[PDB]
Write a protein that binds this DNA or RNA. Structure first.
Ligand SMILES: [Mg+2]
Ligand SMILES: [Mg+2]
Ligand SMILES: [Mg+2]
Ligand SMILES: [Mg+2]
Length: 49
RNA sequence: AACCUGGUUGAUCCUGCCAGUUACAUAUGCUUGUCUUAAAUAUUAACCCAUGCAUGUGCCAGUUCAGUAUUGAACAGCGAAACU
């Protein structure tokens, strides 16, 4: 539900594994623009200050 | 260098012009060893056009699940595309 804290969503995302044309094995994942971090929170108080 | 000289007569003195004389612009002829400097399709068509180039751009700080590198388990180096 909404009330759900960030950290929940951080580790609840998805990752992808693949073998490269280079015979390599990497693990990749995306950033989540919209994630409610403390930084976003800090800034808002700062602004109203 | 605030200069002028030849030509109208058989001689002469005049107006007066043609001519010479001078500078400077493009043209052009002939001739060209250095160094410094340098204009350059404007005039005749603001006429026509092959071809190549003449305008692009990214950071620490708008979006990277491209790719690299086995890299803070959300994402942290470099770093194209593409939306901005
Ligand atoms: Mg007479
Ligand atoms: Mg005579
Ligand atoms: Mg007479
Ligand atoms: Mg004259």
């Amino acid at each position: 539900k909404k009330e759900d804290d960030p950290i929940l969503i951080k580790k609840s995302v998805i990752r992808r594994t693949f073998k490269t044309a280079k015979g390599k094995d990497r693990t990749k994942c995306p950033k989540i623009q919209r994630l409610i971090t403390p930084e976003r929170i800090l800034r808002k108080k700062v602004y109203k200050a």
